[PDB]
Amino acid sequence: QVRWKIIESYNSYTFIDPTQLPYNEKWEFPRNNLQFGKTLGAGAFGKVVEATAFGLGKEDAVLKVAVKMLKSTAHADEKEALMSELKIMSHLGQHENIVNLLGACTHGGPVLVITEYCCYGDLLNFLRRKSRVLETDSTASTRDLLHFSSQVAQGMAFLASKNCIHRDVAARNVLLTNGHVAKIGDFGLARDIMNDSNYIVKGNARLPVKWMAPESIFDCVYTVQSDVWSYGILLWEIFSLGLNPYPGILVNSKFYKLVKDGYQMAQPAFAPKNIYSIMQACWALEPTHRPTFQQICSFLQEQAQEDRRER
């Protein structure tokens, strides 16, 4: 699969899986006080649209928001997934680098999940635009790339503390909001996975193989340490300004043997040695030897301090 999921563990402790048990009427919002705007993006089962929420939250501010919903294509299994996402997001609590849940409309019509809106779009395209610009005729700095890396590492650290796995860590799934601050969220339902060649067919599913840890690919094992590997690939995308992972290499038998054998992409053009060390660490074949997101956060902080010390 490729959706957020609370797993069982006991640093962090799983007292309960929000998925089981019905939903908390604690997030209900007036389906009327919502004016649908432009369609931010759409997928196979649903879509997410921009909108204005009148009187949302304590501060009755009329802030801009994003609204996810299903399509005709969505059946039962599809409806459950949306409710489950809702249940997970209502249980995770808020964080500055997560696309936070703001409300929902589960009565008097189709289910609508309201979350924060990210005015600048996804990171991958932001990166690709700057790089294209590099062949000059706003210019990202090492600090800029470090911040993106930190913000995401912080979001992932938060998820990990809640025993929540992401499963689709990639630059395409990193959004940029005010101040160009990065945020992560479950965007599967609005992801056109069936027609995105980055998602390889595995019979009963479509998986982002180039971003997946070996154990997840070969043993269907998904843990927080699997997400760490994926984060390593994300770092490579960030510091190469958006090149596709394993450039020119197709996903087939050869590929699997390569990753299985310990093959690792080369250091990206804009990554300092220290940052490539993070990538290499994240790509340890043995999950237990990979760093935790907090360890990544603290190391990244050190790189930001030294960079500043340098000015």
Binding site members for ATP: 40-48, 68
Q: Which of 32, 238, 37, 56 minimizes the C-alpha distance to 119?
A: 37
Q: Phi first, then psi: what are they for 226, rounded to 5°?
A: -70, -45
Contact 96, 159 (CB under 8 A): no
Residues 165-224 that bind ligand 5CN (CB under 6 A): 175, 185, 187, 190-191
Q: Which stretch binds ligand 5CN (CB under 6 A): 71-79, 118-126, 218-226, 248-256?
A: 118-126
State the minimum distance, in angstroms, from the CB of residue 9 to ligand 5CN: 26
**Cα–Cα nearest to 43, from 93, 78, 8, 17:** 78
| Min separation Cβ 136 and ligand 5CN, Å | 25
Reference 283, options 297, 299, 272, 267; nearest CA is: 267
User: By CB under 6 A, is residue 117 in contact with ligand 5CN?
Assistant: yes
Q: Is 168 a catalytic residue?
A: yes
Verify binding: residue 234, ligand 5CN, rule CB under 6 A.
no
**Under the criterion CB under 6 A, does residue 103 sit at the interface with ligand 5CN?**
no
The single residue among 85, 105, 122, 217 that binds ligand 5CN, judged by CB under 6 A, is 122
Letter string b/e over residues 147-180, b meaning 16 or more CB atoms within 10 A of that residue's CB? bbbbbbbbbbbbbbbbbbbbbbbbbbbbbbbeeb
Name the DSSP letter for residue 204: S
Catalytic residue among 17, 60, 137, 168: 168
Binding site for ligand 5CN (CB under 6 A): 40-41, 48, 66, 68, 99, 115, 117-119, 121-122, 175, 185, 187, 190-191
Q: What residues are annotated to the active site?
A: 168
